[PDB]
Write a protein that binds this DNA or RNA. Structure first.
Lengths: 52, 52, 124, 147, 210
RNA sequence: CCCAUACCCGGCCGUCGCUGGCAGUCGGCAGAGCGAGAAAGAGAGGGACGCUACGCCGCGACGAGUAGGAGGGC
RNA sequence: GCCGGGCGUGGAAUGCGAGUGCCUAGUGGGCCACUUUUGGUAAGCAGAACUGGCGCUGCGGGAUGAACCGAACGCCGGGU
RNA sequence: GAAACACGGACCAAGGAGUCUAACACGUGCGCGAGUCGGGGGCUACGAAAGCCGCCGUGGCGCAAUGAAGGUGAAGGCCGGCCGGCCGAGGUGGGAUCCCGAGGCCUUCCAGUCCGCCGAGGGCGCACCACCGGCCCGUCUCGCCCGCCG
RNA sequence: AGAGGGCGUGAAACCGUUAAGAGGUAAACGGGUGGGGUCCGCGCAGUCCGCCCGGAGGAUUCAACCCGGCGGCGCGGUCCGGCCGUGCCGGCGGGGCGGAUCCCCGCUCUCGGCGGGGGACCGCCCCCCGGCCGGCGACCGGCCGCCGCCGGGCGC
RNA sequence: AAGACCCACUCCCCGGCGCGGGGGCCCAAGUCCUUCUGAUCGAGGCCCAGCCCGUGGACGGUGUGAGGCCGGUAGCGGCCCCCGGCGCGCCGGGCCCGGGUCUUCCCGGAGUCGGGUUGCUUGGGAAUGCAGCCCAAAGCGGGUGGUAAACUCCAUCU
């Protein structure tokens, strides 16, 4: 915590370094795609297969 | 990372002592293999001897 | 730029969504509170937004808060603002073709002669 | 990476990506920037207008330090001082205006490129423009010279 | 053979350059040679500092840099003369000297005689023969705290004057800084020809009066 | 009446397109649908396979090639 | 030249998703034919216009064939 | 235009030809972002590596152009009487997306709300494009004014 | 010695021989079958997989219970308590750092000017607290319950 | 520099003598049990010390493939010479020295600079440098101050 520091406490033993930021907080999209917020805004899966 | 868990220090014989160290925030940094594979295959070229 | 586009009338409740990155502009003083969703926010632009009581979102949190994109304003930075496009278009040395040529250094003796002066041959 | 280059995909193809009719000879058009007034005339008129000729006065012993004058716009003028300074003036009620020493930051000339927050300053610069002086006066500040 | 829109390049390779290519594989080994003789230098003169004699405070020439301060070659002979130091017992106690320097302003000359003052006090002079200390020597119990000084001795800090906010007077408000510069630019240019036209401005009267 | 590598029909390969479809494997905290010509609501007061998502699957159309260009090479 | 307001039966047929910007290789010896055509006695000659070919292209036909007639090519079965 | 009465070629093995450096341009990936970069120098077997130093960013490029040069150097309106306040960072058309909603979406029937959905119409309008303005530098014409230590 | 003194491995061109086949439009090749060899298929009586029925067996034997152990989930509609916060907030706070916010030692001509050290302030971080917020599904335990699995008794 | 008046110590240098670098030599631990092979350094095992060493698991040798067979490796390990170095004391010498103040004196490098001209050279452009020939100095002078020239101020070096 002194060579790289937390996100809100810059590293003490570096000049002005701080940890990189995350491009997406909630990483596991499995826990995302099965959420009531998403699952209410989706059209029904058209999975009946249509062959020639 | 809504919380940082608590890591336990182990003694010299394998038991877990009473102390507990907070997980440093560096272990929660983003996992970027593309950067690691970039930096590794460009710093391995600096120990290289010349030949001609 | 996004302050300029969010002070438009039928807005100021919607959320700012930009796929690029939000850099801090040092030439603006007051900062309204913002609800921003970008791929990456520069370190100073976080501290200046959050100090104004704003809110910074990422795209996984955008889908959780608004799946269909309801109540968001999708923006984009200046696409042809790069230095490169000032060399594009019609070639220089052409009538009314205000195009930057490629010169190794600028000075009084780098492309200030024959093609440019009416006293030296001609000009366009 | 020689394994990513094009020549790996040209193995087997006879001319190696340079044509059979117009073979890859040594120097078809001449070496360097040749033929400026000659067979390469069109390229120099269409893409480097002004390349040929002299204009101006030949200054012999140019010492770049004499003509050194890095400008600063009024847009980023308050960035030369801390945010504590900028807030403590709009909070101050005695009309006490902070002094911005431009030369200390590294610039010499002040040019007025944009708006200013309405609170007075006393900019200790070395050169000013006309419009730059107007903005600082109109806000209510002063323009002091220094050498 | 130029292509389409590109840049007119002049590489300086028409000479035979491939005989004088200085490669830099010395560089990692060069640094070690430098460092291992920089430490061995300090080992030789162990109580004396590592950087060596102190340098004077020196402005810069060339009005691009003249707001900056460096460490010059040596103290001028006037600076040593005011400070009460003989210019030959000066280099012996680690005070760098060069007589080539002059002092065009006392504002700088006073600034270095203060520097020689503090160094003359912060110095711990060992006795030549320990069994017989002289007058110039230091207190015997001060010799035990003789540790070698690393880094540039008395490093120069380019500090500015922390001034405070004022309330603008009516005069600073009503000063035309731009117009006064354009005025000053004009006088220093026409000062010569105004004198000549004023020279014979008295010659076109003295032929008139007689 | 004879037959081309042309046309029709059928198979298989590949490319291209639909910027096609699939996270819904939602199971005694269960109830098996979204092929439906018609802008929008099956709304509340014990059970095979699969989905190396850079994966899998379905439709159409298309396929000559030097110089040259690009892509993929388990 | 500005505002402001009002009028869609989208004002011929047919077909088809378009617009747009970079970077750019090769090429810059061509040749043949219906028709038009200049020089020439004429030429598988020299020189042009328009379109298509050959070059870069196999296939069926003209016995043979760079260009003619048909028809343009993934690998196969049936039919024509 | 080659099967050519065009040239190279008896046969076999192994060798055998777009590379490296510098510069530039564009495309692309990554980091940081009005900044960015230690490349040079320092600092504490593999390691000649790695780490670190911003009071090592000197410096490079970028953030401002223009003129041969001296040089100059990038919005305005509106009210009150050259001065005092106020509104104060262009407009037009086309614009992905978003926003409001005229209405309208079944259990023996009727009333019927919350939520969701649909939609004529009407909006703020990203990027970018076309055009009209505006500002800075050079230069020209017309002029009419203001400022001050000499 | 299938390593025999330029001797590890021992390719191709080329040659000798043996075995097989062929042989007047030079040979070689493409496509299509045919014949003949070559070896291989360890080919030669050709499928297993569930499920239920029928007939002969053999086990320590099922279900449901009893005790021990482990696990899962908990909307326990709102269990207690921890720890953590890229949650804020409340501080007669104790702090170490940042800032271009504002008495004294030192100092060159006792007062004016000046450099160094404190102090006030701001902002940050963390700590000693107090209380809410939230998670523990990037991080937990003791209970309580439902279920499951295993072990052991019975059951026979 | 000398003179006078003060202030301040008088000990440094030569010639003789004694109390890490190079070379040589050494330093841990299995040829343990079965088992493969022409030969093992292979395969397996060595419990409750899951053999033994390890500051030594670099490498090489050894009848395939070795931390424990051998040389080595590790060690701020030992031992033995050798050269340098470090001060000290002795004997012989050399050596009397500085600083400030005041006065009174003194002080500079020539066939060179510089000028012309020719030729080479340079980014050096009405000549940057160098050289030949001709000219040929001055002393509040001389050189430079990136445009030839005069005048006049500064600056800067000798």
């Amino acid at each position: 915590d002194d060579l790289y520091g937390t996100w809100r406490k810059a590293a003490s033993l570096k000049s002005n370094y701080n940890l990189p930021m995350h491009k997406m907080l909630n990483t596991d999209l499995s826990r995302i795609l099965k959420s009531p917020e998403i699952q209410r805004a989706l059209r029904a899966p058209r999975k009946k297969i249509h062959r020639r | 990372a809504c919380a940082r868990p608590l890591i336990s220090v182990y003694s010299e014989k394998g038991e877990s002592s009473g102390k507990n160290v907070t997980l440093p925030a560096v272990f929660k940094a983003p996992i970027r293999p593309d950067i690691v594979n970039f930096v590794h295959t460009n710093l391995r070229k600096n120990n290289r001897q010349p030949y001609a | 730029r996004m302050i300029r586009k969010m002070k438009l009338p039928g807005r100021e409740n919607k959320t700012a969504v930009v796929v690029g990155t939000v850099t801090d502009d040092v030439r603006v003083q007051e900062v309204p509170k913002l609800k921003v969703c970008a791929l990456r926010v520069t370190s100073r632009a976080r501290s200046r937004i959050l100090k104004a009581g704003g809110k910074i979102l990422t795209f996984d949190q955008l889908a959780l808060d608004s799946p269909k994109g309801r109540g968001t304003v999708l923006l984009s930075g200046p696409r042809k603002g790069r230095e490169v496009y000032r060399h594009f278009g019609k070639a220089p040395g052409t009538p009314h073709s205000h195009t930057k040529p490629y010169v190794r250094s600028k000075g009084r003796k780098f492309e200030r002669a024959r093609g440019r002066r009416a006293s030296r041959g001609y000009k366009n | 990476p020689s394994r990513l280059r094009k020549t790996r995909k040209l193995r087997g193809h006879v001319s190696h990506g340079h044509g059979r009719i117009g073979k890859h000879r040594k120097h078809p058009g001449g070496r360097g920037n040749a033929g400026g007034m000659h067979h390469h005339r069109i390229n120099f008129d269409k893409y480097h207008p002004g390349y040929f000729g002299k204009v101006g006065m030949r200054h012999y012993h140019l010492k770049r330090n004499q003509s050194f004058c890095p400008t600063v716009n009024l847009d980023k003028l308050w960035t030369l001082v801390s945010e504590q300074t900028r807030v403590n003036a709009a909070k101050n009620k005695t009309g006490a205006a902070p002094i911005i020493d431009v030369v200390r930051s590294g610039y010499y000339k002040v040019l007025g490129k944009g708006k200013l927050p309405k609170q007075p300053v006393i900019v200790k610069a070395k050169f000013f423009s006309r419009r730059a002086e107007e903005k600082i006066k109109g806000v209510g500040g002063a323009c002091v010279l220094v050498a | 053979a130029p292509s389409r829109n590109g840049m007119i390049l002049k590489p300086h390779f028409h000479k035979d350059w491939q005989r004088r290519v200085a490669t830099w594989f010395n560089q990692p080994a060069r640094k070690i040679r430098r460092r291992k003789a920089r430490q061995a230098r300090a080992r030789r003169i162990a109580p004396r500092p590592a950087a060596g004699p102190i340098r004077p405070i020196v402005r810069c020439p060339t009005v691009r840099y003249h707001t900056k301060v460096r460490a010059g070659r040596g103290f001028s002979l006037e600076e040593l003369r005011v400070a009460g130091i003989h210019k030959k017992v000066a280099r012996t106690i680690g005070i760098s000297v060069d007589p080539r320097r002059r002092n065009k302003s006392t504002e700088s000359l006073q600034a270095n005689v203060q520097r020689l003052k503090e160094y003359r006090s912060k110095l711990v002079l060992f006795p030549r023969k320990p069994s017989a200390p002289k007058k110039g020597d230091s207190s015997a119990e001060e010799l035990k705290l003789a540790t070698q000084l690393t880094g540039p001795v008395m490093p120069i800090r380019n500090v500015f004057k922390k001034e405070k906010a004022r309330v603008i007077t009516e005069e600073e408000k009503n000063f035309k800084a731009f117009a006064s510069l354009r005025m000053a630019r004009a006088n220093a240019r026409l000062f010569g020809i105004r004198a000549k036209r004023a020279k014979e401005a008295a010659e076109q009267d003295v032929e008139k009066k007689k």
